[PDB]
């Protein structure tokens, strides 16, 4: 995991992660203290899938 900092964009993360040896990039979208979307891209130029998460439930629940 890498905390998203400042004004780095998904395309910039993808180009930076490709040179670091990463294969797939997963970005969790949260707003109002709730995760509601998930976009996964396949480095370096693979297809990017955008999902919407729902019924999130951690192990304790």
């Amino acid at each position: 995991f890498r905390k998203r900092t400042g004004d780095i964009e998904v395309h910039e993360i993808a180009e930076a992660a490709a040179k670091r040896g990463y294969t797939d990039l997963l970005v969790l979208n949260e707003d109002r203290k709730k995760t509601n979307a998930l976009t996964l891209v396949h480095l370096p130029n693979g297809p990017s899938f955008y999902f919407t998460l729902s019924n999130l439930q951690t192990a304790k629940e």
């Binding site: 004004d7 964009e9 729902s54 019924n55």
Partner: protein
């Protein structure tokens, strides 16, 4: 005129007034301050100057008492330079011998309209997430159909159906490491 107009509009009814708790505001497009006052009323002030923005360019608008009954020609307009120092001097030259309060309020509006244009340009360059609306009907439809889909999925039945299926096919080595000896013996006798 002006004192009669102000009594009618400032105290009986103006369609431009927004009555707030701490202050009254003006819906007029020609108000420099945006407040309902006697000095900032464009209707009650026969000589009035304001700055407003048109497609990225700020203009100085002025009206005189002598054009008050010709609405199409009431307000005159000049271009204010992008150079801030020249823009301030343009207001000073065009508003020469006007009251110092009116020039003061026009220069204050020029600063706020210049900052807003600056902030508008910087927002364009930045990458900001697009706000997408939440549709109450689609949320209700997808929440109900999801509940039906989860029930129809039969996850535990299908998970164990596949897990046993791949146990039969021997996707593991010779004997799997996840199975007790007695269960593995039952698998061998049944599958053969």
């Amino acid at each position: 005129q002006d004192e009669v107009i102000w009594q009618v509009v400032g105290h009986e009814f103006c369609s431009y007034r927004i009555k707030g708790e701490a202050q009254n505001f003006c819906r007029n497009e020609y108000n420099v301050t945006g407040l309902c006052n006697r000095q900032s009323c464009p209707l009650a002030n026969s000589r009035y100057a304001t700055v407003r923005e048109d497609n990225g360019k700020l203009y100085l608008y002025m009206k005189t008492i002598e054009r008050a009954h010709f609405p199409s020609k009431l307000w005159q307009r000049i271009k204010l330079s992008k150079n801030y120092a020249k823009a301030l001097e343009q207001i000073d030259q065009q508003l020469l011998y006007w009251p110092g309060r009116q020039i003061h309020r026009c220069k204050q509006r020029l600063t706020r309209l210049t900052q807003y244009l600056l902030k508008a340009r910087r927002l364009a360059l930045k990458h900001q997430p697009a706000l997408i609306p939440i549709k109450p009907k689609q949320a209700h439809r997808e929440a109900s159909r999801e509940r039906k889909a989860l029930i129809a999925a039969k996850l535990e039945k299908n998970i164990e159906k596949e897990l046993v299926k791949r146990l039969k096919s021997g996707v593991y080595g010779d004997q799997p490491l996840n199975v007790n000896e007695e269960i593995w013996n039952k698998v061998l006798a049944a599958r053969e």
